[PDB]
Amino acid sequence: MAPKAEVLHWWTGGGEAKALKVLQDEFAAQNGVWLDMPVSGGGGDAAMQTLKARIVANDAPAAAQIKGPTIQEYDEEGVVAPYNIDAVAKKEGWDNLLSKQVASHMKCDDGKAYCAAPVNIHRIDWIWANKKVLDSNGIKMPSTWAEFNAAADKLQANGIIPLAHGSQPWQDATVFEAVALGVGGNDFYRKAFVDLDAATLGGSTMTKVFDQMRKLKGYTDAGSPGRDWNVATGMVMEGKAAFQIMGDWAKGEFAANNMAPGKDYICAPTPSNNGYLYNVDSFIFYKVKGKDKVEGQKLLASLMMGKNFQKVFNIYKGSIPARLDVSMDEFDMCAKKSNADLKTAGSKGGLLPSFAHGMALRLAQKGAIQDVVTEHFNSNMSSSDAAKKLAAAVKASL
């Protein structure tokens, strides 16, 4: 009788779990039976592999955390229809509650039916800094990479780890994409990671992106290989390191440890020309056996798109609402800056999808790029060799 749903996600511990708790509590308040299927692994690559295996085994969960064109790629597998939550989306008028771009991402049947619910917009192009460390070292928050490298050299010379970073493929790629946006610009990022333009992927602007990647390598510590993103954030909160380049799920950790922007830590975008790299956490609802699981799915979709839910969920998560009509008044200064910058970058053509977090590219392309980025980062590869390999690896993945 009760609505039921197995939910596959990678929100394991910390600020991620705290925010997810908001959803779990609302689902149980409507007598929903939550069947937890967590797959631990920053950024979701591991969940994506376990998710693919579940669907190949004809064991699809009722709901899965998923990104962008992976939604449409599963739809093309034929495993999502019928679109029982589009009935929810039409009655509630989702096309009037979401940007046209986010609405596109959520839709199946060649854009005809909603099949996924969005809960948020994360931003990738952020730098987090320990305020006491920067004040202690007479360092202004940098606004260019030249200013960042100079601040990093000064901190390094004072015995301080400048950049807390975990070297895992997706995590290298997260920094890489923020760097690319600033070194090359909005049109460059679009051409490379949205168009997959070969001349751009292997060109001299991409060489300069790998140039800066090589500099950032020198600013990380010996414990970086395989370190979890949230450990890196932890070292910034404890003042073991000065900076972290990471999306604003890092803010979920700062909040969960009772630190405030301005007073305890500084948040500033990575350099860009009115750029913004967006990331929408969303849940797809698969074809499933059982009327209780269909009602579970429609109940999750509705809850996930609620006005008050997206206010409370996102205060904990670190992101901003996907819903357009949610009051930002209660959010902190970093989230209000995110929402402001999103509006500005949208009007300037700088509002671009993160590829490291699944909005720009299907998983085959995302993986090809990550693999080249992490090999450059963890070796002594030249920048030009990396750009050649990047363009070849994208081309071969097509």
Ligand SMILES: OC[C@H]1O[C@@H](O)[C@H](O)[C@@H](O)[C@@H]1O
């Ligand atoms: O795992 C770290 C982060 O990975 C991203 O891809 C997800 O969109 C976030 O919700 C998550 O907190």
